[PDB]
Amino acid sequence: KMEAKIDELINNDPVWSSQNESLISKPYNHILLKPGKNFRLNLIVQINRVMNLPKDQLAIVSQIVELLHNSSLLIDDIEDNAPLRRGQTTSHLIFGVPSTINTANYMYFRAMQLVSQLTTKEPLYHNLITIFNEELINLHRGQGLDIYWRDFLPEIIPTQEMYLNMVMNKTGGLFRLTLRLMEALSPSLVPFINLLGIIYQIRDDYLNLKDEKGFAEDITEGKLSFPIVHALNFTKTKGQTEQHNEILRILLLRTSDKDIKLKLIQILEFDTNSLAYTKNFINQLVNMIKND
Amino acid sequence: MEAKIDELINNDPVWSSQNESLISKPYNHILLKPGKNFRLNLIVQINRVMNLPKDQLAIVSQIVELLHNSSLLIDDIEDNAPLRRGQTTSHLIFGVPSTINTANYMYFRAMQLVSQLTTKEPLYHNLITIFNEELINLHRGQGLDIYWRDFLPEIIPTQEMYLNMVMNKTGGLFRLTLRLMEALSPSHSLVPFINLLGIIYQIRDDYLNLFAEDITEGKLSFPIVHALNFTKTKGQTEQHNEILRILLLRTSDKDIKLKLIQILEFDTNSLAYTKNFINQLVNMIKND
Ligand SMILES: CC(C)=CCC/C(C)=C/CC/C(C)=C/CC/C(C)=C/COP(=O)(O)OP(=O)(O)O
Numbered sequence: 001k002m003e004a005k006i007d008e009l010i011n012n013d014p015v016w017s018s019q020n021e022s023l024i025s026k027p028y029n030h031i032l033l034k035p036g037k038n039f040r041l042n043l044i045v046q047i048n049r050v051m052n053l054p055k056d057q058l059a060i061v062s063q064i065v066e067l068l069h070n071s072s073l074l075i076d077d078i079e080d081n082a083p084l085r086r087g088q089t090t091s092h093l094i095f096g097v098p099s100t101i102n103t104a105n106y107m108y109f110r111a112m113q114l115v116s117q118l119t120t121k122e123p124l125y126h127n128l129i130t131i132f133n134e135e136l137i138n139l140h141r142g143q144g145l146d147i148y149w150r151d152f153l154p155e156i157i158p159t160q161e162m163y164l165n166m167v168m169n170k171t172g173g174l175f176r177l178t179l180r181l182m183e184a185l186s187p188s189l190v191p192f193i194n195l196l197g198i199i200y201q202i203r204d205d206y207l208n209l210k211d212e213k214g215f216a217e218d219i220t221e222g223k224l225s226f227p228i229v230h231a232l233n234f235t236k237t238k239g240q241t242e243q244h245n246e247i248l249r250i251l252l253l254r255t256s257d258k259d260i261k262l263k264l265i266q267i268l269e270f271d272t273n274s275l276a277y278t279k280n281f282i283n284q285l286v287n288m289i290k291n292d
Numbered sequence: 293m294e295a296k297i298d299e300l301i302n303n304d305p306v307w308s309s310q311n312e313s314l315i316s317k318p319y320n321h322i323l324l325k326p327g328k329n330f331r332l333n334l335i336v337q338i339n340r341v342m343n344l345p346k347d348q349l350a351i352v353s354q355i356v357e358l359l360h361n362s363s364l365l366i367d368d369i370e371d372n373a374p375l376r377r378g379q380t381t382s383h384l385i386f387g388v389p390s391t392i393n394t395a396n397y398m399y400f401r402a403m404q405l406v407s408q409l410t411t412k413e414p415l416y417h418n419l420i421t422i423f424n425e426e427l428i429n430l431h432r433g434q435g436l437d438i439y440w441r442d443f444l445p446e447i448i449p450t451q452e453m454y455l456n457m458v459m460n461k462t463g464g465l466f467r468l469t470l471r472l473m474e475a476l477s478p479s480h481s482l483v484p485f486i487n488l489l490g491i492i493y494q495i496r497d498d499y500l501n502l503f504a505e506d507i508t509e510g511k512l513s514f515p516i517v518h519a520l521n522f523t524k525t526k527g528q529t530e531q532h533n534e535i536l537r538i539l540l541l542r543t544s545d546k547d548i549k550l551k552l553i554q555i556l557e558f559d560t561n562s563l564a565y566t567k568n569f570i571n572q573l574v575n576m577i578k579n580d
């Protein structure tokens with residue numbers, strides 16, 4: 001009797017009830033509650049004017065990008081110890097870091113599974129899987145560097161050039177993934193999508209300081225954001241020792257003190273002019289398209 | 293400026309050998325102590341009948357070694373384990389952020405190795421599908437294990453629930469290995485056998501754990517599951533509740549740990565129940 005139950009278990013595919021699906025989906029369902037700006041989704045609709053994928057294929061590509069985007073935020077908020085995401089408590093503080101890590105990773109592989117419902121043309125299929133794998137590798141390479149510079153500061157002080165190659169991997173990754181899949185499926189805008197990704201990341205960095213995640217949470221997180229990279233390299237270059245050191249000291253506190261965060265922003269505004277430099281840099285990238 | 297940007301966006305992302313070493317640090321750390329290599333030695337034994345060519349067999353081994361070691365990095369973060377293979381866990385040295393990312397990164401470097409197994413598009417499709425299905429099963433198994441543990445005492449798993457979970461959590465990488473080998477073989481499936489091997493392997497691991505860190509971690513191990521269900525069934529409220537209180541302490545007190553280990557040994561006889569259950573499983577194969 002014990003034997004037959006073991007036999008039945010080992011001789012059949014692993015069983016998975018919808019009740020269990022609901023238990024381990026909690027972390028992800030929570031983040032779905034507040035949709036974001038849907039910038040990537042709208043980007044997908046627009047781009048389809050030229051690519052012309054059938055409604056059904058397009059829905060799958062959208063689902064894949066939404067799964068990857070949202071799960072990547074679940075992981076990034078654990079990796080940054082972020083208290084808020086889209087104005088609500090982050091999933092890992094509600095369900096725990098362990099379940100949130102496993103759920104986000106599980107969703108990466110469900111996104112992978114959807115890639116098969118895109119086609120049966122073995123030539124195409126292979127190319128699709130390859131695009132997915134390459135860009136998931138690129139995403140993790142960039143995320144890995146961003147995380148390393150932040151957690152081991154001041155071991156490595158990146159240069160503007162180093163930051164830009166990191167963003168090409170980290171932020172450029174899902175934008176290139178989306179576009180490469182759609183382009184592969186069309187009955188090249190990658191360079192434009194790379195620039196768009198760089199502008200998106202630097203702008204996010206800029207706005208987090210200029211201005212829901214909390215007041216300037218990138219400082220509390222110790223991030224080597226575009227403005228900070230400019231500030232540290234500017235102070236190094238000009239021999240501004242006291243301030244170079246104060247920028248590093250503040251980043252290392254991982255502080256939520258609102259006055260210390262503003263102190264740091266004012267050093268960028270008045271001592272290194274890092275805010276004006278970043279605002280200008282963004283406009284210079286945007287003009288490359290406006291002047292195309 | 294415009295020129296530099298132009299070259300950046302028109303080229304593949306820049307990634308160096310040094311960058312690769314920086315992000316590999318947490319993985320390289322756990323590979324400093326080999327472990328027993330049960331899975332890779334298993335692969336060799338099984339190839340005696342699968343006869344894969346040495347180069348494909350090596351890629352299967354690499355895929356399995358990357359998944360096994362990256363899964364340990366993640367499992368250790370998920371139960372905040374202080375030690376793995378006699379040394380400090382990677383996340384306590386490189387931090388949780390870098391260790392999550394590196395382990396997740398290696399999951400995809402393992403995926404990439406699957407297209408190096410074959411050029412035949414029919415077979416490739418099959419291999420990728422096998423990899424995808426079992427990574428899904430592994431996460432369903434690991435998510436239930438984590439769920440029951442972190443949500444205790446909401447759900448006390450039964451013996452059958454534990455067995456289904458373990459077949460995915462631990463049996464999952466054993467099945468991936470064998471499915472990939474059977475798919476590639478140039479020569480009856482061994483999946484039922486490997487599923488039972490995975491189950492025995494985990495129950496045996498739970499048994500041996502009893503540092504008894506599974507206690508400090510609040511784990512619903514095979515012996516604990518037997519003890520909780522045993523006490524419930526017999527109306528032994530006090531013992532049932534005592535086992536739960538100790539698990540819920542997430543204690544590092546050796547004295548309190550010994551106390552639970554004795555309840556399991558002398559009051560519920562879970563250690564003996566466990567040992568005999570393993571033997572019953574081993575005979576299921578032997579006596580065949
Ligand atoms: C699976 C993926 C995509 C990545 C794996 C590796 C990881 C965790 C990378 C982190 C990638 C990341 C979070 C980059 C930052 C991109 C960015 C600016 C996100 C925020 O985009 P919004 O459009 O502002 O967010 P909403 O959806 O709330 O509007």
Ligand SMILES: CC(C)=CCC/C(C)=C/CC/C(C)=C/CC/C(C)=C/COP(=O)(O)OP(=O)(O)O
Pocket residue numbers: 326327328329330331359360362363364366367377399430431434461462465493494497
């Ligand atoms: C990518 C994979 C495999 C899974 C994804 C989801 C996760 C993180 C699952 C957890 C899987 C896990 C760690 C199961 C336990 C397996 C086990 C009993 C490991 C210990 O095996 P040993 O053979 O004693 O280890 P050594 O390598 O040190 O010898």
